[PDB]
Amino acid sequence: RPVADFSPSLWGDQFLSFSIDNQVAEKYAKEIEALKEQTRNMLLATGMKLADTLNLIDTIERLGISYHFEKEIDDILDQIYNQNSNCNDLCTSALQFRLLRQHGFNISPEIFSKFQDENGKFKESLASDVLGLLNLYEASHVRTHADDILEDALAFSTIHLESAAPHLKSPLREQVTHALEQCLHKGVPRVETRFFISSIYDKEQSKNNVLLRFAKLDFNLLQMLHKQELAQVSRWWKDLDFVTTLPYARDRVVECYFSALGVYFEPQYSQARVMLVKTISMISIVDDTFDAYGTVKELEAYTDAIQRWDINEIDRLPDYMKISYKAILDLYKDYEKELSSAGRSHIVCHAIERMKEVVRNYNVESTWFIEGYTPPVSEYLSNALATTTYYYLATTSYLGMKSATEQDFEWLSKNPKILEASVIIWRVIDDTATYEVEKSRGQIATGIECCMRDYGISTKEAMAKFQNMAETAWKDINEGLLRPTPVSTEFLTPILNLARIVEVTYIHNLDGYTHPEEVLKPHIINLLVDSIKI
């Protein structure tokens, strides 16, 4: 019974209830339909140049209203992919690369040859093209293992954007400054959409009023929906009262909602988000139980209870674990009921199997701690990957998705490279971040520890190696998105977002879920409190 420590929730009952004025909602919806159809006609414009078509698509995407034009934007990029017209200018070429690649079109990086000398490096003469540099920088983060051409693209555009930025006009200066701390591709969609609309496009002189208006309204309307869901989930979490009954666990439902919200923000994924938040919260309790409270013997009985997954096993568990255990089983029972109507209740097991896997490994992590076992990196990862809970959350995100078939879950059960990459990113990033705290304590059992021992290298060199694993992972994720995809892209995005969440949460190399204050707090306010002033 180790000392408390964990900071209490900052929010309180701030989101406990949200009465949505259907008056303001309908008006917003009414005008959005108009602006929507008006934006549609913009995309279907015939005599439009390449650069214009790309800038238009990029903007609608950054404004976060592109989910209205899945088909439209696709048929247009498809054509652009098949016509292969050379734009000759860096700005447009880089953007054509990124947008196509992000949509799975395997466009060749040969397009970037004309901007490199006979040596293969970028012409230093482009150092004055700010828009060209910015779009390249963005594009360098979508490269795969086959794109060795873009090898130096990131370092190139970076050093020169940092040099040029201080004298740029606004909002361009701000856009560049923000891109340097957060590229678009590895950032959370609503978070970047919130930043684009309010900090950039609104302050853009050449802004398209129909698009900005559309953007602000749509964003604000969806925020109402998110506020509702969070309310609903906040009430659910109070009825469990784990804040009083389990004072050792972290109270972070708003933070858990944020993740669910970064996995998907569309209204159609409302049922999905709710299920997902509940599970991220629940598994958070379990992580806290193994990590800071439970004892050797108790954890063992807990892991067995989870594997059996009955209810009779509850008696073998101490009183405090009986609450956790039952909560978990009742949660899945609700899921089974929620899906009963569509007849999709039979998929819930897939998530349960992953949870057992998560717990088994949690337990092993514990055993290693007690023995003081420092396994070789390979052995460490074979266990430390599932403890990230990403195979688990990844499977959970499919529950609430009405389109998810049994086949989609089977594909996911084989541990796809795309899923594997996402899990590794969380793993290495988390270990890099949480190293000193665990070792200043002592923990010869941590990720960086096994790495330094296994390879006989310094701490600096070990974290450096972990960074490359994350870079490798990202490249695998990008490759993963390329067509033909194993499953509908609709099922690849959740995984992609889970990795975006890691990048956003551990950006200052600090645990964002445990220490929200300086990392996650602003985002939550920007997405779930403050609306965009119309």
Ligand SMILES: [Mg+2]
């Ligand atoms: Mg643990």
